[PDB]
Design a binder for this molecule. Structure first.
Ligand SMILES: [Cl-]
Length: 227
């Protein structure tokens, strides 16, 4: 198909986010590349407004599921690539248990040969010295499964899933995710059977970088369908 063929090689990625969490306004710019053949992502993010006012891990899911590796026998279930190049809207509510919430609206699409993720993020209801605004989350990331379903009247997909962020005392901060994607363009898009994405994510720092930043290496395989 048109859209899948755009991903057979290494694709440059740009991420741009504007955020407001409890009145803390901030922006992040990221760059890197994806190789969907291997389900592989590398991205470096820099907070361009100074210190990021929330923990970096909390923004990982918001900062391009078109880079998931869909096995050949599952190609007919890959909504994300099918929407390309015109792209998709991706909306979420991320509910931090016993704390505030993020609501995100993003558009993921090509600009030339570069895959771009532009995001608006709004966070409200955060506790001033909860785990988020108090910066009590460890700089690491657990592996998760993302459960996707068709959303046919949207001509798209949905997902609800749980992210657990380790807290510095050894506990975990749950971040419930509810997600809806909608194609932007007029080409045919794939409405998948139920399946999941299996994700691992590793966070690191660039030893040479003194701006507030995050390096992310992530591998994603679609799974849960046999034929
Ligand atoms: Cl952090």
């Amino acid at each position: 198909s048109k859209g899948e063929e755009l991903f057979t090689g290494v694709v440059p990625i740009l991420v741009e986010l504007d955020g407001d969490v409890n009145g803390h306004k901030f922006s992040v710019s990221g760059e890197g590349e994806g190789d969907a053949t291997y389900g592989k992502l590398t991205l470096k993010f820099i907070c361009t407004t100074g210190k990021l006012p929330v923990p970096w891990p909390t923004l990982v899911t918001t900062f391009v599921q078109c880079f998931s590796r869909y096995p050949d026998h599952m190609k007919r279930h890959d909504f994300f690539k099918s929407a390309m190049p015109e792209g998709y809207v991706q909306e979420r509510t991320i509910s931090f248990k016993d704390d505030g919430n993020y609501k995100t609206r993003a558009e993921v699409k090509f600009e030339g040969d570069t895959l771009v993720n532009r995001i608006e993020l709004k966070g409200i209801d955060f506790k001033e010295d909860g785990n988020i605004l108090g910066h009590k989350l460890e700089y690491n990331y657990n592996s998760h499964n993302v459960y996707i379903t068709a959303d046919k009247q949207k001509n798209g997909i949905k997902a609800n899933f749980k992210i657990r962020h380790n807290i510095e005392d050894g506990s975990v901060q749950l971040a419930d995710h509810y997600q809806q994607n909608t194609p932007i363009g007029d080409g045919p898009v794939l409405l998948p059977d139920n399946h999941y994405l299996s994700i691992q994510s590793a966070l690191s720092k660039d030893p040479n970088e003194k701006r507030d930043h995050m390096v992310l290496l992530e591998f994603v395989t679609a799974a849960g369908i046999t034929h």
